[PDB]
Design a binder for this molecule. Structure first.
Ligand SMILES: Nc1ncnc2c1ncn2[C@@H]1O[C@H](CSCC[C@H](N)C(=O)O)[C@@H](O)[C@H]1O
Length: 264
């Protein structure tokens, strides 16, 4: 054992921040979409304005527009929340069907019904515990599950749980996948991830729309890389942003998902 990884040092420093320091650090220098227009239109019940239902659509757009994920066919979206990934996937030409599942209930996101482009091929189901769902074949497997915790043992336990569950779906051989890895940086987790890459491929990618307060990376089929290096690079990035003054957010215009239905 070589002791403490950079990500463990990052997490320990994060937990030593005051609420003020934490607040300024959380968005320092990150990329963000402005959600003002969408938030207003969704509150007014507007379903045809092209608005994304969450910040998640922009996160998936960042991966897809770079070719790190190429969705196609039957898309399964585990932990779909409001549906940002499912509605984004529905606009993609090679996608033909989107099934999203999410827990819902008090304190959790419920699916939002809008009519962005391709809404007629989307089915979102709440009240579903995905850890009790029998895996089934699909072409594209998405999972965005992993709730942040100030305890790294809790984040590790939660990440191992997600990875064990998605393994059963990946055994059905989807050709594309995008899996949130909440806590990728412990030595045990990195050995687990490399074993999973040897069986299923892919690599981990840091999305710049992620907040500095989480070390989340996305395991995606379209960006194979050395996970030791990709995780360490992200840890160094996040540690460096803890020094020096708070830096401006890079604001982007949010996703326009259009409107209308798709043929078959
Ligand atoms: N056991 C479980 N079964 C189903 N959903 C779960 C779950 N545990 C957590 N979740 C859900 O997974 C979601 C992850 S956040 C999903 C955001 C989504 N990608 C978007 O773009 O909008 C949360 O809404 C959470 O409630």
């Amino acid at each position: 054992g070589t002791g403490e990884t950079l990500g463990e040092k990052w997490k320990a420093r994060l937990n030593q921040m005051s609420a003020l320091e934490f607040y300024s650090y959380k968005k320092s220098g990150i990329t963000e979409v402005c959600r003002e227009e969408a938030r207003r239109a969704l509150k007014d019940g507007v379903a045809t304005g092209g608005h994304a239902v969450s910040r998640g659509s922009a996160k998936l757009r960042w991966l897809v527009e770079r070719g790190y994920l190429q969705p196609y066919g039957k898309v399964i979206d585990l932990g779909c929340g409001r549906g940002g990934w499912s509605y984004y996937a529905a606009t993609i030409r090679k996608v033909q069907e989107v099934k999203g599942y999410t827990k819902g209930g008090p304190g959790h996101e419920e699916p939002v019904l809008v009519q962005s482009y391709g809404w007629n091929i989307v089915r979102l189901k709440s009240g579903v515990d995905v850890f009790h769902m029998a895996a089934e074949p699909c072409d594209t497997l998405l999972c965005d599950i992993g709730e942040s915790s100030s305890s790294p043992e809790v984040e590790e336990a939660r990440t191992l749980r997600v990875l064990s569950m998605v393994g059963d779906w990946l055994e059905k051989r989807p050709g594309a996948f995008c899996i949130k890895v909440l806590c990728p940086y412990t030595s045990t987790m990195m050995e687990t991830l490399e074993r999973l890459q040897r069986r299923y491929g892919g690599g981990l990618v840091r999305v710049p729309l992620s907040r500095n307060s989480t070390h989340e990376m996305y395991w995606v089929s379209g960006a194979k890389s050395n996970t030791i290096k990709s995780v360490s690079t992200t840890s160094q990035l996040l540690l460096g942003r803890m020094d020096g003054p708070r830096r401006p957010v890079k604001y982007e215009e949010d996703v326009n998902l259009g409107s209308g239905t798709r043929a078959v």
